[PDB]
Amino acid sequence: SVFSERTEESSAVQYFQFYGYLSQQQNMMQDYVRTGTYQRAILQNHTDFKDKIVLDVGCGSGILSFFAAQAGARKIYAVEASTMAQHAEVLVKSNNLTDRIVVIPGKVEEVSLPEQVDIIISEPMGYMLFNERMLESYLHAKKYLKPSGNMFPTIGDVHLAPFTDEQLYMEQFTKANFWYQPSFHGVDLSALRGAAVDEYFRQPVVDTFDIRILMAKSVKYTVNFLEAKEGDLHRIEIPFKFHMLHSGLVHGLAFWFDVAFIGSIMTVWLSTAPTEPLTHWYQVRCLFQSPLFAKAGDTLSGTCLLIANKRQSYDISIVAQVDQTGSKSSNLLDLKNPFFRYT
Amino acid sequence: SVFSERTEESSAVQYFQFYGYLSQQQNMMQDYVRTGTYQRAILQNHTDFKDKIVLDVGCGSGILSFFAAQAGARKIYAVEASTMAQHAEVLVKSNNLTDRIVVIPGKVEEVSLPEQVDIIISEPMGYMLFNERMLESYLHAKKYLKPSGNMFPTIGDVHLAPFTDEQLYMEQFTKANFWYQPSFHGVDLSALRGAAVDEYFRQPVVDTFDIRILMAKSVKYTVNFLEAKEGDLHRIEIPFKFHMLHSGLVHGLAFWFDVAFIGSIMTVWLSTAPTEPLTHWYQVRCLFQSPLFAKAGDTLSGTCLLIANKRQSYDISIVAQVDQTGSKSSNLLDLKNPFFRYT
Amino acid sequence: SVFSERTEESSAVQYFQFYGYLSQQQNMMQDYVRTGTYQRAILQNHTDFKDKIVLDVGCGSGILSFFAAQAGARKIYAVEASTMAQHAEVLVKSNNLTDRIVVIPGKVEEVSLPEQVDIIISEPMGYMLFNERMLESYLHAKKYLKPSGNMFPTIGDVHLAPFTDEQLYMEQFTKANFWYQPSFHGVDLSALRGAAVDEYFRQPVVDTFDIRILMAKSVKYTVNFLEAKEGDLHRIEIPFKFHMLHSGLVHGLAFWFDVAFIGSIMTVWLSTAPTEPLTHWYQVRCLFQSPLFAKAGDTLSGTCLLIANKRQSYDISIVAQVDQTGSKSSNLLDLKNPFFRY
Amino acid sequence: VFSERTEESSAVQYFQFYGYLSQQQNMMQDYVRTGTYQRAILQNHTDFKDKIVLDVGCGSGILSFFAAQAGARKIYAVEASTMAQHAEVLVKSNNLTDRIVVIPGKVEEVSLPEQVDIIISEPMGYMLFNERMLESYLHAKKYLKPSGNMFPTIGDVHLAPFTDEQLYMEQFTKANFWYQPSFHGVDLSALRGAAVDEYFRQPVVDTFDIRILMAKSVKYTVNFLEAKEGDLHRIEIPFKFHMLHSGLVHGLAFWFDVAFIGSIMTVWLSTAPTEPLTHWYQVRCLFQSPLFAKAGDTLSGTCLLIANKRQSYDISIVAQVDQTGSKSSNLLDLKNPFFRYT
């Protein structure tokens, strides 16, 4: 199958076992912005669901299929690969919806559906949007979509901006300095100093922050889910050119994302920006090993490149330079092993 | 190998990837109780090491070998299976010890050593002593030990005692009762409550506590590493009879452990008891499904049975009764997925 | 002469030139602890001066000789090598004391005096007590002292203790990291990072601090000026063994000193300890490049070695170990070039 | 030529100062300076492509790398302090050994193998001329082809009159310390006059608000392509100010600009008080007595700069109000300035 060709078994086992625990579903359901915004988007475009056929990709507990059932859908196929699939069936029966919601256990790349559908629904966004590589499963499912069908969400916007933060940078540098010692219980550790700094700085930082640390207006990269192909996501290249609004030290780049549900009656937006109320995705920051000095009015140009790997994530390469001086920085991050700093 | 035959691949991969990180070594090295007691034990029995041949099982960074080098050892074989092995080689060279310490990458069950040794050293203890199943690798290595050779540590004691803690018990229902509601965004969740409760009680609780919660003197179970065979650790049966010192409700059983280094000059002890300073092992508590009432002077009798599993861990079975009353309780727990409660 | 043999001309010129400015004298006189304690020491022991012959080594503005005159001295010889000597004579005349204070311009190692003296006075203490190497001149002067004569000050005590202060360490670590940049306007600087760290950490830190940063009771080293010889100050070796009172990271060593005036009527002490009011000497701290972890009850032992150099200062070597563990640190400092942080 | 005009004691301290990495670091972090040099060199690329270049006093080497970015064919980098060992390290690690050659020693004493198309350097001090390094810059023209260029090409020194009551008043407040009859029993007053005199001989280094300026500045221009070394031994600057404002004049303020004149464009570097602050700040020299002037009046006189053997200048200023005949003067020693900046 297409899924098994691109994924380590070892990663997949752990991945689907993780989502088999009820406590993680509980943790996800309790993010009110998320759950409420999805329900808003589905119910306010009810004519896109009334008497239609629906596909839910990766239903988990089943909550989204229930929303589609509320809006008047005629038939819903709910696909799920973890053991949570057995808990979903229990809720379908105790809620008297056996005539409308059909649970199909397995991977969407591997199951057979009985008919083509009018519309697809899913929640496939990870950290920085792309983590976990589930977006590829979402696009694959378009093999079941009619020529005039729709997708919910319809498009995704990724946002990038430069930031300054001394305190975070010193905190990570302090940890690395352990390996600088010439006599730990009589043993010299210093030969490993270089290896330790590299390891710590490859960890992306997950938390939130005050918007006043941003040093320029953000740049946007848009993916249209109606038009895009699966193959498009194996190599993602994002160019940027910033016009600096403030002078100072740039310690790295900050990331977040928006998605849009474009229905027949209206468009509804879900956002994880630092100007909006907090969600379980927070925001994401990538540090430079050495900061760049820039003055107001200068331009900061470069590229962010994402290449998918077999542990269901991405290798990230970031290169940036201040155009007026030639000061240049490069860095590598492993999205697989983040540092959770919050509270 | 004897190792691959007892471990699923998926588990082994993550297990050895985990220990390839320098931060993880750093965390273990910075536990002073742990690292200092080993050094004292090796140096104060210097007649057990000077001009001897030594084996270090699972050397990680290599620290214990360096302690053996300080005590005057003639030759040390240091075996390590994760990629940390590449870093250990760097440290031996920079410390001028290539003529005495030999790093061997691989599994202790699969590599070849050229000669027999006088003494074996290792740090294989996990949660509740036995978790992670590395103690089986330590005993296996005895195929290389000369007759009348020695082991450091020499014996291990696991301790058990009954406790009372009303708040901990009450916490589990508070968490599970999330699922007991008829209209979460229009959906009735109550049918899954029972399953949620069960999931929480199968988790052993990791943290520390005030010794005044203990209700009787502990029972001790001893393993002699000079005499035991590997197969002895697949099924461990611990009978108990407690003489109650205080009246009240018993909510479950508490666990901790000691090891002893028995040298020619002196015996040295390393303890993780709640009467001693905290280590990175903390202590472990297992709840009964229902509490038992006992008055001072009564006897509490029963058995704790530990069964090894395929995820490099143990299934725990506990059965207990009050002799004067016939009041009875049980629990079965999965040590692979503990709840880290410490704050 | 003995002075010129141990000193580069270049250093000495700037040195005596520095002390020729009235503004620096103004700065020194305005240290009230300093000026008041000396006057107290001399006047309360007035019988050690009454009708006696006195020598003042390095009189500057002349202030101490006026104190000696106030206590009833018969004759005071005042030696000074800088141009401040021209200004001191002006004050002697305007205060009508020409019959009792005699200014002699030049170095104490080179001038000729008419007679032996009963008592010697001076203020020769620098940073860490020993900086500027003037203490050698003070002892050299005993060639003019009668057999049972006295010295004011009489003894000096040096104190040592271990400290913890992460922010200072990171402050110095932060500056050096400039040389870590791989692309400063397109240029790779990193090859020098090691040179920058060494340079920064060789600077002793001059300032004051809260006493709660100290991790053990101090060790004391005593110099007796009545018995000591000049040569004794060329190489100073101070061994130490600390019993740790607190667990934590040791970032370096802190230094200060006391001197005592032992008169026939009473003993008077002048102190620069962090428990006492601040003076213009402040305190001095020497950092390790890498800190040492220690527990309560452990012992920290080693030696501090001081070597005199030709720029009128000292080369400092510090070596230390935690006895229970074998953890060791070593470092080298240049007392000539401090970092003024206050 | 260097050794005949500088006392050794001075040269020692001077080259010792620049041997510290921290001072290079301090100069490199001034963005205006480094950025303007980089822009001037890169935007005039036709002036460097395939050329032979000389870098006078390269320090860390930063300017030679800019010359390398612009396409220079060969660069000779001369340096007399120990920084030379470090510059060699950076050349090697940046893989430019085939194009940059480091030469330890003074430009007056080393030998160069060939004539060059262009010379680059950063030799400017306080009020442009302090440190006397410009004479070395002009001395290097013995290696310059007849049709070569110099970067920088010209230098402008600016003068303007100022008013500042508080600064003038500060000097007496400090000097009046000595005007007291019993400091611990001693009469100090006889030294007051000498104290005042000492303070007024120091030029004040710091910055200020432009509204204290009372007339448009007067400019004195040096063209480095045409000038000879000897031109800098005696610098006579005449002035005539047309007053824009009425009030009391307390002295004269100084600053400077330099220009890079290339084939494609001219680039300017300015230290004016209307521009962002640099590490040169500005310099102010007081009159001993202030002069009253009305708007529309003319203020005329002379500033004469005389080079001395301590690698600096003696400053002589004379001024008069033409309409009234009110007159004032002062003489200052730039070698020992007062650092006032707060």
Ligand SMILES: Nc1ncnc2c1ncn2[C@@H]1O[C@H](CN(CC[C@H](N)C(=O)O)CC(=O)CBr)[C@@H](O)[C@H]1O
């Ligand atoms: N190829 C595949 N085929 C079938 N199922 C798949 C799959 N890849 C992932 N899944 C499954 O999709 C689910 C993803 N989460 C489900 C939450 C659900 N939308 C809800 O609102 O409750 C949402 C999430 O993880 C985003 Br943070 C998980 O349960 C996962 O097991």
Ligand SMILES: Nc1ncnc2c1ncn2[C@@H]1O[C@H](CN(CC[C@H](N)C(=O)O)CC(=O)CBr)[C@@H](O)[C@H]1O
């Ligand atoms: N070999 C020597 N022969 C003669 N005079 C010498 C000398 N070495 C130093 N001096 C002179 O001694 C003075 C320094 N002392 C302070 C001056 C005087 N005690 C005072 O009260 O102001 C002490 C001090 O500054 C410690 Br901070 C200076 O004026 C210095 O020039």
Ligand SMILES: Nc1ncnc2c1ncn2[C@@H]1O[C@H](CSCC[C@H]([NH3+])C(=O)O)[C@@H](O)[C@H]1O
């Ligand atoms: N069977 C095995 N063969 C070889 N190494 C192993 C085996 N099982 C575990 N290890 C390693 O043993 C180490 C145990 S952690 C203790 C590390 C080190 N002795 C110290 O004192 O810091 C880990 O680094 C594991 O990767």
Ligand SMILES: Nc1ncnc2c1ncn2[C@@H]1O[C@H](CSCC[C@H]([NH3+])C(=O)O)[C@@H](O)[C@H]1O
């Ligand atoms: N006569 C001389 N010969 C060689 N170098 C000199 C001479 N006079 C001064 N210097 C050096 O010139 C430098 C002036 S500072 C400029 C340093 C560096 N090029 C930069 O712009 O960052 C100092 O390093 C002095 O030591």
